[PDB]
């Protein structure tokens, strides 16, 4: 997360840390959506172009954390994975279309002050908030610039961008399952996500009912905080039916 800052304790209790078992290594962000389910970006798990094809026993999940590295005792909860579920139409050949994935936990976690799930949006909720110029919030332990990594969780707030403008800001074949967000050079503000932030949530607060809903998953970009480039987040709502189907199973 570039041009962000330290996150206030318990300010993102759905934040999940995706963690490689050997070498022990933070891989990606993720999000808690229930006691027994976690949402991350598919490419955190499956990306043939970089030889990545992790499976369940390759990984673990760390919930309720704040420090990037140390074992925050009786705060964080660690879970192994029963199942990984990747979107069957997930596209790693071209554009990361439907970069979305679910992990079911071997044992459901207990909610606490540092551990709580996020809401998923309705038609209604997505219809009204996922609109250009409106702001959301990206959080992660990912890198702080493109060319080093932060000690505690980072937060930044970014405006959504007009679908056309995303299309004109890149070469990659954009789709309806993606939205871009970030500032423009006129506006004289900054901010973006980065390598390592994948899987983490782009969330929005509802002014109607005061809850946080997860509208995006950090999917991709081109460098980090680059002038006239925008972060790309998987469009969560658009893929809600897949989600819903997998959970009911």
């Amino acid at each position: 997360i570039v041009e962000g800052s330290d996150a206030e304790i318990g300010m993102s209790p759905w934040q999940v840390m995706l963690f490689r078992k050997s070498p022990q290594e933070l891989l990606c962000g993720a999000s808690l959506i229930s006691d027994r389910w976690v949402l991350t970006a598919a490419h955190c798990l499956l990306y043939p172009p970089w030889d990545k094809n992790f499976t369940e026993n390759d990984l673990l999940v760390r919930i309720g954390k704040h420090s990037r590295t140390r074992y925050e005792r009786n705060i964080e909860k660690i879970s192994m994975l029963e199942k990984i579920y990747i979107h069957p139409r997930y596209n790693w050949r071209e554009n990361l279309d439907r970069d979305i994935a679910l992990m079911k936990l071997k044992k459901p976690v207990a909610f606490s002050d540092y551990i709580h799930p996020v809401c998923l949006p309705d038609r209604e909720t997505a219809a009204s908030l996922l609109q250009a110029g409106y702001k959301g919030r990206v959080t992660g332990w990912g890198n702080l610039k493109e060319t080093g990594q932060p000690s505690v969780l980072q937060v930044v707030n970014l405006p959504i961008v007009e679908r056309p403008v995303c299309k004109d800001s890149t070469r990659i074949r954009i789709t309806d399952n993606m939205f871009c967000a970030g500032y423009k050079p006129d506006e004289g503000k900054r901010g973006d996500a980065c390598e390592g932030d994948s899987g983490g949530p782009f969330v929005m607060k509802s002014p109607f009912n005061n809850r946080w809903y997860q509208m995006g998953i950090v999917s991709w970009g081109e460098g980090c905080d680059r002038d006239g480039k925008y972060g790309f987040y998987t469009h969560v709502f658009r893929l809600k039916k897949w989600i819903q189907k997998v959970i009911d199973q």
Partner: peptide
């Protein structure tokens, strides 16, 4: 899930994190 999106240390104790009003304001 029944109690989603309400953070123990903020919504529940009736506190604002220090950038959430950034977000709300953006709704014009």
């Amino acid at each position: 899930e029944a109690d989603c999106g309400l953070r123990p240390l903020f919504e529940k104790k009736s506190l604002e994190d220090k950038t959430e009003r950034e977000l709300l304001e953006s709704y014009i």
